[PDB]
Amino acid sequence: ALAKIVFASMTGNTEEIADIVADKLRDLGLDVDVDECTTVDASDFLEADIAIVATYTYGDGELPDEMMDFYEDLADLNLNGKIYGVVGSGDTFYDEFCKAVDDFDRVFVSTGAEKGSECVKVDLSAEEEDIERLEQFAEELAAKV
Ligand SMILES: Cc1cc2nc3c(=O)[nH]c(=O)nc-3n(C[C@H](O)[C@H](O)[C@H](O)COP(=O)(O)O)c2cc1C
Ligand SMILES: [Ca+2]
Ligand SMILES: [Ca+2]
C-alpha cells in the first residue's frame, strides 16, 4: 500500500508533523511519498491508496497562499475508493484553530474519499501528546489497508 502526503510549511512545524506521520507509516510497512504542495499535482493522489494533507492555517483566509492551487485542484477529483486523513499545525491563540484542517477535511469528503482516522490539529510545534495522536492517526490508517 502507498500513502501520499502533501504538506505546506513556512517555518517547519507542519513539515515535522508530515515527517512524523510518514516515518510511522514507513515503519508499519507502507510505501510513502512526502512532497511540498508546490512540487506536486493533487491528481498524484489518484495513484495512491491513502491521501494525506498536512497544513498550517494562516489568517482569515485560512489556507496558506502556496496551498491554494492544490486545494482547488483537489476539489475537482474523484477519490472514491481512496482513504484520506488530514493533520495540521496552528496556534490556539486563534479561535480558528487549525481551520485549514477542517477546510481540507470537507474538500476530501467532496471527492468521495473515505476518512480513515480523526483529523489531528497541533498547537504550534509538536510535543509528546501530538506524537501519540499522530502515531494513532497513522496506526488507524494503516489498519484500513
Ligand atoms: C499571520 C498569522 C496568522 C495566523 N492565523 C492562524 C489561524 O487563524 N489559526 C491557527 O490555528 N493558526 C494561525 N497561525 C498560526 C500558524 O499556523 C502556526 O504558527 C503554525 O505553526 C505555522 O506552521 P509552519 O511552521 O508549518 O509554517 C497564524 C500565524 C500567523 C503568523
Ligand atoms: Ca514525491
Ligand atoms: Ca474546479
Residue numbers in the entry: 2 to 146
What does the paper say about this structure?
Flavodoxins are electron transfer proteins that participate in a variety of reactions in prokaryotes and in some unicellular algae. The identification of flavodoxin as an essential protein for S. pneumoniae infectivity and the fact that flavodoxin is not present in humans open the possibility of using it as a target for the development of novel and specific antimicrobials against S. pneumoniae. According to its gene sequence translation, it contains 147 residues and very likely belongs to the so-called short-chain flavodoxins characterized by the lack of a 20-residue loop that, in the long-chain flavodoxins, appears intercalated in the fifth β-strand. Either structure shows the archetypical α/β sandwich flavodoxin fold (5 α-helices that pack against a five-stranded β-sheet with a 21345 topology, forming an α/β/α sandwich).
To understand the molecular basis of the interaction of the FMN cofactor with the protein moiety and to provide a structural frame for the identification and characterization of SpFld inhibitors, we have solved the crystal structures of the SpFld in the apo form and in complex with FMN, at 2.18 and 1.69 Å, respectively. Overall, the holo (note that the holo form contains selenomethionine (SeMet) residues) and apo SpFld structures are similar with an r.m.s.d of 0.8 Å. The main differences between the two structures are traced to two of the three FMN binding loops encompassing residues 10–14 (phosphate loop), 57–66 (50’ loop) and 92–100 (90’ loop), the latter two sandwiching the isoalloxazine moiety. A further noticeable difference is the presence of a small 310 helix stretch at residues 38–40 in the holoprotein that is absent in the apo form. In its bound conformation, the FMN phosphate group forms hydrogen bonds with S10 (sc), M11 (N), T12 (sc and N), N14 (N) and T15 (sc and N). As previously reported for the apo/holo flavodoxin pairs in Anabaena PCC7119 and H. pylori, the entrance of the FMN cofactor makes the two isoalloxazine binding loops to move apart. In this reorganization, existing interactions between the two loops in the apoform (Y95/G60 and E97/G62) are broken and the protein expands: the holoprotein surface area is 7745 Å compared to 7135 Å for the apoprotein. In the holoprotein, FMN is embedded by Y59, D92, E97, Y95, C99 and G60. The isoalloxazine ring of FMN establishes π-π interactions with Y59 and Y95. The dissociation constant at 25°C is 83 nM, not far from that of Helicobacter pylori flavodoxin (27 nM), but two orders of magnitude higher than that of Anabaena flavodoxin (0.26 nM).
